[PDB]
A paper describes a structure:
Phosphoethanolamine (pEtN) cellulose is a naturally occurring modified cellulose produced by several Enterobacteriaceae. The minimal components of the E. coli cellulose synthase complex include the catalytically active BcsA enzyme, a hexameric semicircle of the periplasmic BcsB protein, and the outer membrane (OM)-integrated BcsC subunit containing periplasmic tetratricopeptide repeats (TPR). Additional subunits include BcsG, a membrane-anchored periplasmic pEtN transferase associated with BcsA, and BcsZ, a periplasmic cellulase of unknown biological function. Cellulose is a common bacterial biofilm component produced by a variety of prokaryotes, such as Escherichia coli (Ec), Salmonella enterica, and Gluconacetobacter/Komagataeibacter xylinus (Gx). These Gram-negative bacteria synthesize cellulose and secrete it across the cell envelope via the Bacterial cellulose synthase (Bcs) complex.
To our surprise, however, we discovered homo-oligomerization of the cellulase. Single particle cryo-EM analysis at a resolution of about 2.7 Å revealed the presence of BcsZ tetramers, in addition to small monomeric particles, Figs. 5d–f and S3g, S12e and Table S1. The homodimer interface is formed by helices 11 and 12 of the glycosylhydrolase-8 fold. It is rich in ionic interactions, including Asp344 and Arg318 of one protomer and the equivalent residues in the symmetry-related subunit. Combined, these interactions create a square-shaped tetrameric assembly with the cellulose-binding clefts of BcsZ subunits at opposing corners facing in the same direction. However, because BcsZ binds cellulose in a defined orientation, the 2-fold symmetry-related subunits bind their polymeric substrate in opposing directions, Fig. 5e. Oligomerization of BcsZ may optimize the enzyme’s ability to interact with and digest cellulose to increase catalytic efficiency, as frequently observed for carbohydrate-active enzymes. Collectively, our results indicate that cellulase activity is critical for cellulose export.
Residue numbers in the entry:
A (entry chain A), B (entry chain C), C (entry chain D), D (entry chain B): 23 to 360
The structure:
């Protein structure tokens, strides 16, 4: 009645106070992303004590005491003066939405109104402070409260809103109704060679900027897109569209035995061999039983240790799904394996 | 470039002299089955030193110095006088055929004529000492050189000849050409309720004896049948028929979350919960992704230790194919993952 | 060149930010004693990065940013309102003096003026705020800055000032010179049956209060007294007198094979078997070659895990001394084993 | 109620059948010494199941079925033809005497007449087949049944007969009475520079051959002599004489922090650093409380793994004595710690 990979992640990456630590940065940082991934994993494992401790740390240290009052700062860690505090008070909306979803599903599944209330206040603040109306698209999720919107252009991160989370949020009405449809546009229209970009810009009156560009590559952010798509229920119509769109990533992984590290989104030119977390991300995405067992072998023989936050969380998501640690319903709800 | 489950099995179950030890028996036995499984696993791991050591011990201690001269004795262990020697000189043909196949495929893949010579001499002797012509069937593989054939009846063990091995042996002509077809008959015609029996008798003029009987149950022997069927390539025409015949075993494991320990073959009534090795045996057999993931979780969280020979060898087979440790071609050859 | 027991203590008990955590208290506390023991052990291990991290945390969280400005609060942990802060701002002078000694010896051995400046300021403040003149004795070290000196009743803790630390501090003049002498009086005059008390009172015009009393027992605080005596160099003239005074503790441990949990100081009656850390504390204190080995075997076979802060630090001191992890010179300096 | 180092030694070095395996040798050998050390350790550990298993293997495979009928072959392992059998049927008298003592003390302590009968038969055969009268000495223990006694040049090994065993055997009368004395002569008269030789010759008239020679060095055999001396009871008159004779070995180890690998017995010149087993052999021998703890640290931090039979059995003897796993009485009996 435990999730062993989650138990090891707690022992190596989560402090006694409840903060998720990326040991590879010299400042030993916590991100709102890491906190939200801890909350998700604790929910899926039915680990309410860990959920509460992580939530407490998040509220006290990223949100000045309350997620009902402000979106969490995305970056926390050690300053030069030996003090540990917020390093960047801007938000990161992938952290924000995973937090809000985890809180709402914890409130529903553990029958705790407090979680529902916090997750509701959080989601409404996401809608009012990070969602904006983009001419030519409609409502769109910005990657953060500031820095991604100009007068005539906007920058988006396809990995930030999993289609299952978007489906779930539609129950709360606008703007999530529209976001479920504009998120599908973001995923399907920005992969001209079958690879989703880490980052992509949209300009008023012109559309997506898909000419070759430094951050228009499929690497560490975008590897999650394929994973989120793999996690969709087979009865979701968008799933087949999305799997067909990204088929060249699956094809590459099948032919070479590994996912690439970086893919030029405009040319489809691949470089490097992705780390173990990328192979974990391929487990829900790949549909052939044999190609899946190649990635399943690579994850099992190179399982991340304590020096690799991002490989470990990618493995929690991808290998966890591979072992039925959680599922998503047709309404985007958690179907727990408790 | 190692198979970790296999390396652990070597360290906990195989002596320095190359004998595979079942620790649960007070006589600390070795079987021809265990030796053949060790040879198979060593070939699949590309572990030629282990293979040579285990073959040496087999020839010296089970075959009085040569598998070319006699089928291996099936049971070796400690006698009451403190001496360690053969306990039963009869053969077990599942060990015999796995030995023969492993020797032939090692000769081919490692380009070593000695292995081919021993394997061919072994297979020829199997054909001449344990295969007999049964009125109503044709050539049939007996479970053992003696004790399974009377004047008008015979007793068979469906688990002994995996279809991929039978397909491989056809290349050597008769009787293996016929045995490939009569093995299918043995598997398909003795499972009236969708469950294969550990043991089943055939009487001249009467046919299969499928009335309820103590050993006409699907338990520790017959669990391998499903696994062997799961390991057939999809391009094998027999595989669809066999999967369909045994669908009630899959259906039970999907609905309940575990394979059963014992199923009455005449009624289909099932009892108990099978050990972890049975869940491993289900991994190649189950076609549903979710049911396959449930069994995968059970194998991962209850992986066999040093006190469970049979669960471990079933996990080597079942979890090893789940992780692409070996594949069988359409002609029954080893497609190695080296 | 590492100290494995210390490496394991860091991984199980010291937070990334440098706080030493006692997991057995539900508030997950840090004490000034824990911080000072971590500083000592990092110095002994030649672990300067750990030393700096622990020092930073101590200054920021126990000393409002600076050990030059105040003695550290002795108790920090989780409050009922979910925040983490000082729980009791009173000092504990055992942590204070271990911290000062460690800083001064770090300054000397690592040639860092900053450690010397902090240690000197801390030691001078200990003199000003915790040392008082007691009629009949002279200068005396109080267990803390408030609560231990009343109308005519002072309360002292014999385990607080190890004779080697007192020797080291004499280099700074008064009150440490005379203190070295009053500490000997405290140790030698309050053990009428050969056992040192956890706590003992001195009353004006009456003297030591040595009538049986709840806290006049040799238990969890006092076990350190024997250890500190065992750690004195054989060339310290006080050593032989103390070993003779405390001989009944050694005789008990030798005759019974374990140290007692609780001894009535007034009568010598012992109750219970001390935990593993008590056996580690006996290692420097014993002088036969047969009793020591018995205690060594108990520590080796019952080595503390992750749920046992006090057993673990007692083991770092006593087993670390038993493996030559540090020595004390005749002047109380660290003779490091780097 | 287990001896953890012995439990691990069984798991890594002792086969299921009960043979002690040296893994460094390509023939994976068992020696009579290894079997005797396994028997001793199992007795010390009160592991009667291991003792019986090891004794069974010893009798069946080194003594053609019975230690009552012949001394054990000293060397057993794999031949080039792949079979496993006796490699040298000559004896090694160190294994012989440890096996005899262990059987006699198992018979006495476990009240089992069978062990006494076998041990007595073995000891009387040792006297008949390996003990000879040497002009100028008297009865002497040869290192083996054949090859160590010629025209007038006998060869002896000072490490073979521990003084505690010689004391124990005196209870059986001649030749063990005088032997006890000539063994003292051998140890005290062949170390002119304070170091005992691995091997030393004696010639009629000319006496001990103590001029420098390739085998007249203190190395892997002779390291045991110091350890056996250290294991004598303090009330044995011979112990102080032997400790004084061998003072230079203790002085070297104290001054340098490690025992040497090889010492010229004629000059006292030392070379190299002895492996961890030599440090363990110094634990009973070294008499300071602070020297006995540098070596203790070296054993703790470099504890032998699975690839180091000799270091491991030296550690079982030396660290086991250091932890009170066994003691010897003034009559050479086992004082068990059970």
């Amino acid at each position: 009645c435990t999730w062993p990979a989650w138990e090891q992640f707690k022992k190596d990456y989560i402090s006694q106070e409840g903060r998720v630590i990326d040991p590879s940065d010299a400042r030993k940082i916590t991100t709102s992303e890491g906190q939200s991934y801890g909350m998700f994993s604790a929910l899926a494992a039915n680990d309410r004590a860990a959920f509460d401790n992580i939530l407490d740390w998040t509220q006290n240290n990223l949100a000045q005491g309350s997620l009902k009052e402000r979106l969490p700062a995305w970056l926390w860690g050690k300053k030069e003066n030996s003090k540990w505090e917020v390093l960047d008070s801007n938000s990161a909306s992938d952290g924000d939405v995973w937090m809000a979803w985890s809180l709402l599903e914890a409130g529903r599944l553990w029958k705790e109104q407090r979680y529902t209330d916090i997750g509701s206040a959080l989601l409404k603040r996401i809608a009012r402070e990070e969602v904006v109306t983009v001419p030519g698209l409609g409502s769109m999720l910005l990657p953060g409260k500031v820095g991604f919107a100009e007068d005539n252009s906007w920058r988006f991160n396809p990995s930030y809103l999993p289609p299952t989370l978007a489906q779930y949020f539609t129950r709360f009405g606008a703007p999530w109704t529209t976001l479920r449809e504009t998120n599908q546009r973001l995923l399907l229209e920005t992969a001209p060679k079958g690879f989703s970009p880490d980052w992509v810009r949209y300009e008023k009156d012109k559309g997506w900027q898909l000419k070759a560009e430094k951050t228009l590559i499929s690497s560490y952010d975008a590897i999650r897109v394929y994973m989120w798509v793999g996690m969709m229920p087979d009865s979701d119509p968008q799933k087949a569209r999305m799997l067909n769109r990204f088929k060249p990533m699956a094809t590459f992984t099948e032919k070479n035995g590994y996912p690439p590290e970086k893919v030029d989104v405009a040319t489809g030119k691949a470089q490097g061999k992705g780390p173990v977390g990328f192979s974990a991300a391929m487990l829900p995405f790949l549909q052939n039983r044999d190609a899946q067992a190649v990635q399943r072998q690579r994850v099992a023989d190179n399982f991340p240790g304590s020096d690799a936050y991002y490989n470990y969380v990618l493995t929690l998501f991808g290998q966890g799904w591979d072992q039925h640690r959680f599922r998503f319903s047709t309404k985007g709800e958690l179907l727990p394996d408790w």
